[PDB]
Design an enzyme around this catalytic site. Sequence first.
Site, short mmCIF file in Angstrom:
data_model
loop_
_atom_site.label_atom_id
_atom_site.label_comp_id
_atom_site.label_asym_id
_atom_site.label_seq_id
_atom_site.Cartn_x
_atom_site.Cartn_y
_atom_site.Cartn_z
CG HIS A 1 14.74 -3.51 5.22
ND1 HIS A 1 14.68 -2.22 4.63
CD2 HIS A 1 13.83 -2.77 6.38
CE1 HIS A 1 13.83 -1.43 4.57
NE2 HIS A 1 13.35 -1.39 5.94
N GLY B 1 9.63 2.57 10.99
CA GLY B 1 8.53 2.52 10.90
C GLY B 1 7.32 2.54 10.22
CB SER C 1 10.62 0.24 6.55
OG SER C 1 12.06 0.56 6.34
N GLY C 2 8.86 0.05 3.59
CA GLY C 2 8.09 -0.60 2.96
C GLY C 2 7.68 0.76 2.26
CG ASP D 1 15.02 -2.48 0.86
OD1 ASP D 1 14.90 -3.89 0.93
OD2 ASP D 1 15.28 -1.54 1.79
CB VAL E 1 -9.33 2.57 17.91
CG1 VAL E 1 -10.42 2.39 17.75
CG2 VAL E 1 -8.83 3.37 19.60
CA CA Z 1 -7.61 0.45 13.24
#
Ligand code: CA
Lengths: 28, 223
Positions: free
Chosen positions: B40, B175, B177-178, B84, B57
């Site tokens: 996904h 955030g 995911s994966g 998935d 950074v």
């Molecule tokens: Ca960095």
Amino acid sequence: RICPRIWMECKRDSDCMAECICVMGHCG
Amino acid sequence: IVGGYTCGANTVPYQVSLNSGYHFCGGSLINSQWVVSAAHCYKSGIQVRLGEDNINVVEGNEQFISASKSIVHPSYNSNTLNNDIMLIKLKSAASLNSRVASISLPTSCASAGTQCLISGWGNTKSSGTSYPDVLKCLKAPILSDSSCKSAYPGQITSNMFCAGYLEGGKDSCQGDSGGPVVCSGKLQGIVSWGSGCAQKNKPGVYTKVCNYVSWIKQTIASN
Ligand SMILES: [Ca+2]
């Protein structure tokens, strides 16, 4: 509900994936 | 990651960030040219960022390589999130070192009760929003098959497992995911989905990597 854990911005519920909803601008 | 702690710069060397102008999903480096993530998370023109800690950074240990090709599992179902998993080939081989290293594929599936490490740059709040600049970590046990199915009636397939706490409070989140779920030095899971984040009786659901080992090995060697 089934809501993928991908980070995604949104303006409306329909912008989100699967059963995720647009909670204050972010799918969740 | 909700209810977690800070990993520490480059202590999770196989963790990568998928970036499309911004971080949207995580991933795991399996060899110098391949990354495994969730299906996904597919997008064209993905840039993979390795050796990252603070994503805002530049710290000198980063490696930004474009994805050359993304292979989505043949039986992936975007509606049920079954199968998935996705493989991303890098346009150039990554330089492996002390900060950038691959994670081993499992030889057997992990049992309920095994402690695993989940990491990511996803939301850190169950209610509201807060995205971290540095990589977060969470230690969580694999839950029993029964617990998982009772939590998500009719939605759990044989290619998924639940990990977390039924008391809620700690979980992966948007955030993440994966990203990796490592148990005993082996990649056992991939952050996939859930109902909210860290909610009572609603643990995270992960792709069961052990069911895909031969598929991964075949794909990597044929592309
Ligand atoms: Ca960095």
